[PDB]
Amino acid sequence: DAQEKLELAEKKATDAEADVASLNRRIQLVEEELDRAQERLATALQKLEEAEKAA
Amino acid sequence: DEDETTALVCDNGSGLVKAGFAGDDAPRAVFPSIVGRPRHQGVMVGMGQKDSYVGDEAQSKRGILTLKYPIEHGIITNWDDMEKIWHHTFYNELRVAPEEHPTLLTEAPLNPKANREKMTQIMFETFNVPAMYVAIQAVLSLYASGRTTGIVLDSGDGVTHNVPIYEGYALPHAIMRLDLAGRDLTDYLMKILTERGYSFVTTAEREIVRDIKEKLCYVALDFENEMATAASSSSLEKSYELPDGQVITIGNERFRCPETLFQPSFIGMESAGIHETTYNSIMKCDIDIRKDLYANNVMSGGTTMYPGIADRMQKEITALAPSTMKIKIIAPPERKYSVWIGGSILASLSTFQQMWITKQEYDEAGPSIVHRKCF
Amino acid sequence: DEDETTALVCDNGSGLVKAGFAGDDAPRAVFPSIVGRPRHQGVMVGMGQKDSYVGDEAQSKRGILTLKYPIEHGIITNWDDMEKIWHHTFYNELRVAPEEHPTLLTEAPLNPKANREKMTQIMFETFNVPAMYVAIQAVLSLYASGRTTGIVLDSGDGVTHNVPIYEGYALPHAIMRLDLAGRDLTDYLMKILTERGYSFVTTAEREIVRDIKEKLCYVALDFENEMATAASSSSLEKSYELPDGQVITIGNERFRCPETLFQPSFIGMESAGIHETTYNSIMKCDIDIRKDLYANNVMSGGTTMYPGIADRMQKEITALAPSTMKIKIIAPPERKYSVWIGGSILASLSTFQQMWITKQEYDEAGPSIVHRKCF
Amino acid sequence: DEDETTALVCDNGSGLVKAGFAGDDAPRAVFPSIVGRPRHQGVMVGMGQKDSYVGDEAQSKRGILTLKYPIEHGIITNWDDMEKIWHHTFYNELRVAPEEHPTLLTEAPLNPKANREKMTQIMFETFNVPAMYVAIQAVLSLYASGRTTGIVLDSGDGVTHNVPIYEGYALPHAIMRLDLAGRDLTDYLMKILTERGYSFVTTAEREIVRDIKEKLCYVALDFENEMATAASSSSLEKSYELPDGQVITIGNERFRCPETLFQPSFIGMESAGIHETTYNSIMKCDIDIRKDLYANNVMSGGTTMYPGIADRMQKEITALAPSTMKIKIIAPPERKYSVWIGGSILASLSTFQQMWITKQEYDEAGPSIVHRKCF
Ligand SMILES: Nc1ncnc2c1ncn2[C@@H]1O[C@H](COP(=O)(O)OP(=O)(O)O)[C@@H](O)[C@H]1O
Ligand SMILES: Nc1ncnc2c1ncn2[C@@H]1O[C@H](COP(=O)(O)OP(=O)(O)O)[C@@H](O)[C@H]1O
Ligand SMILES: Nc1ncnc2c1ncn2[C@@H]1O[C@H](COP(=O)(O)OP(=O)(O)O)[C@@H](O)[C@H]1O
């Protein structure tokens, strides 16, 4: 029972790990997009400042 | 994987290589001109690995590689590495063999002649291309930008050429070439980042510095005033993420690097900068040419993407130029990619379909033919 | 007993030796790496009594024997005792004469050369092995763990070498060897148990303590808090049965023993512990390597079976490591055996059959051949 | 003790501290850049014992101390420890309180800027020195050496700057900073002495290896010939007496340590060595300035005391140079102390008196004054 609970808890952890791992992949991909969007934004904003200077 | 035997176009320089099919509006393969080699002894068995890594492989596995470029200030000195870069770019990424297509390669007008002699030879002898044409980069810039007339200031990775063209003709006596380039700007930045406490001495580190420059640096319209502020306040610093999770913040170094293009003395070069060479090329052209060249200062190549550069160039040139005269900067979105775009435009012209050296004219004459047929 | 002339694998360290055949999952037999010798004349009838004992006989009869290990802090100096240990494991449990099978032995890259050379000499001259191969324990651990990249912290019985590998390549400038190992943790425990009223001095007392350590001790994720309670209450003590029926209990001293891996000053060592060496091997590598090694701290050797050791190693490194990048401990239930398993994996690779020193090469070159072919 | 308010001169590197007064031709005393601290719990009462020891005190009582270096790769990171080293140097050996005398400190130009600001700041704010001057280390070797032209290769304990100087001018675009220095050579020796069966890891042991290197190692004019014999015969081994009466002998490892200066891959560095950087410093200078630098490869600092180092540097550069010119190594007796000696020369020049930062100027401007007044 400790072993079944262990395999199960290991799976609670493995599944929780699969889920956090899925989430870690999502944070890495989304946060990378956050930063790319933020960088694209910084770019758009820097371009905006120049576009406004151009305006 | 294309269904037509169009000419292939490939702007392969000292930095990056851009390639695609003639007639399109963008390169399809954009890779570094790099062949990487391990600087470590393999320890584990059955690890795969390469003898050498090419293009994106070279940067992807760079943590243990020394990375070399085959092209030095515009000239190929290592054509074995070029064959691998071209093979990868053409066969693996563009999905085409030159064997079934004419190919267009590019070079500055005063690029040493051996450069054209080898680009022609490798495509005819190792890739069996049916035809070849080495193009002038300034020509391609003018086609890409919608011009026949202007000064092409090509700010390259290894060299700045600077050539005036009027009505499609070169004015070669007015070429003002400088040993001032994007690669020197990178070297300058790492020395000043060392001053800040962040030393970069290995290839992986060199690559980081080039990445910092490309994402964080700018010129703005007035350097000395921008530096007076950046040197006085933290509000001008920008953070960059280093590969190991650590960060570097960069202050006035953010612009001192790009500024070398206007102040070459920053890297020990005996030059007045890119705006003065643009001006001198106009100045040495005939008086009835000058007005059209002042109205058309044409950007080509990279570094043209620094915030404030199109405007910095117009400002610095109008400051040297005479009054009454109109000084304009041509700084199209086809920046850094304008040589490739021009290659596509030139290759697709009906007036250019008789210009490639055939695999017959080449076989009879040898590679010296490039100077009889291309430029 | 064995169907094929596969390589034999013998991870013979300063504590235990793991012997079996390549291609399998586990050693066929595990013996202490010892030869025992009596310091007493037997009195009773039916007590055996040998001039010398090997392996499990030496441990079983240890009450009147001094037990010597052939290995001092990672190297075999007692080549006569390693011949008995090898003969016993090979012929009595594996049921093999090495003459008919290749043999794989282990060490680390900064381990003194005498070890790989004497091991090679004995297997070829005493056992007539047809081939030999001395492997790196870090290499074997990464194969067992499903890695090509990572830090292998071989927390052995007499030494920790700590060897970083990236993409299958050695990074030798970053190897950080420590005179910190499981045998020292046992010695700490003997001294602290003496303070508790249970003195241990002789070999048979240094072993029982070794058993106490393996069953009662743990690392403790948080030392100070665990100690504040363990040093204050019997509810944190565990009981051990001594050979004469006496009972010893251990409180905060239970963790004090393994704590030496995190606080080597406990045994008079000028070191901050196994996580400092792990941290530095990663830090001494290039920045495009660092992030992959942080995410792959790989366990090898024993002491890894400590309730809290993996929990603590990941905590200790993430606390030192840069943010953003992942820090991970790779601590599979294949602890203490990750090298043997790796031995089997390497020995059985088809590409590894080109790595062997053959008997003919040995007879021509002598034992120095191991340095031409291994690593 | 001192009859004039001359400048005090001190070279505080990652290795040694050289100190004397301006006007002499040698430092009066040499101390290691070390602050030592007990790593043991005192047992006897009334034993005195300092909280910290400095310089020679730190080495003399090192048996129970851990010894730390406040300077890394040329930069002071621990100013508190340097204040203690400086106080000892100034008050106990030079017998001068800085308040009554100017002080000259020095650094290589690519040393992160924080170092020159702190050297200036500590001397003005904790010692109240009436004046300060942070000098260029490369320059000081040239003054001591009798030259205004040459490549100054200041390979020290933690880093090499390597700067070409012509007619008293720097050529800053041709500086080759490299992470190769005497401290790495020591680390390389510790790894290869471990291979021989002599592991050195603790402070006492690390200091022994630095002493072994300094007395037993050599470069070897011909690396291949020396390892072929040294690795094959005891006739090329040299004995060193260890502090406890035991001995160590070293064979080809004797030259493999300094070999790293020519072979940086031994310590994990992506470099071709000190002669490649010397060559490149020359090559990146103007055509009319490379014919004077070839004839003047100038040594600076230590790691230059090797039995063959000057012999090999001349050979390696002449082998790279396009003949024609003389290639010469300038390797004066003022070795390892040419930087200190130059400091004496510079501090005392009549043409340098206006270069001193006075305390009043410092107090008005703050620590940044070093960039307005020194270099
Ligand atoms: N954001 C940027 N900042 C600075 N330089 C840039 C930037 N974008 C592009 N460049 C430069 O573009 C160069 C490569 O483009 P390119 O001029 O087309 O090579 P080539 O003309 O010789 O074939 C590189 O030196 C790169 O640093
Ligand atoms: N539960 C445990 N608690 C404490 N230490 C352990 C435990 N299991 C294994 N070790 C230690 O690790 C060593 C055995 O594993 P191993 O390292 O593979 O043998 P070797 O060091 O000879 O290669 C012994 O010193 C043993 O005490
Ligand atoms: N005989 C020698 N053998 C090896 N190295 C030496 C010898 N003599 C001096 N050095 C090295 O010189 C270094 C310190 O010299 P120094 O150049 O004055 O430091 P710095 O100029 O950077 O302030 C030390 O690492 C020392 O080991």
Write a structural description:
- The structure is cut from a larger assembly and holds one copy of chain A (55 residues) and three copies of chain B (375 residues).
- Chain A has 55 residues and is an all-alpha fold.
- Chain A has one helix at 2-54.
- The termini of chain A are far apart.
- With 375 residues, chain B is of the alpha+beta class.
- In chain B, 35% of the residues lie in helices and 17% in strands.
- Chain B has a six-stranded mixed beta sheet, sandwiched between helices. In chain B, strands 13-12-11-16-17 form a five-stranded mixed beta sheet, with helices on both faces. In chain B, strands 5-4-6 form a three-stranded antiparallel beta sheet.
- Chain B has four domains: 4-34 and 71-134 and 337-371, 2-Layer Sandwich (Nucleotidyltransferase, domain 5), CATH 3.30.420.40; 35-68, Roll (Actin, Chain A, domain 2); 136-181 and 271-332, Nucleotidyltransferase, domain 5, CATH 3.30.420; 182-267, ATPase, substrate binding domain, subdomain 4 (Actin, Chain A, domain 4, Alpha-Beta Complex), CATH 3.90.640.
- In chain B, helix 5 runs antiparallel to helix 8 (253-259) and helix 9 packs across helix 11 (309-318).
- Chains in contact: A-B, B-C, B-D, C-D.
- Chain B binds chain C through residues 38, 40-49, 61-64, 202, 204-205, 208, 241-246, and chain C through 136, 138-139, 142-143, 148, 165-172, 285-292, 294, 321-325, 346, 349-352, 355, 375.
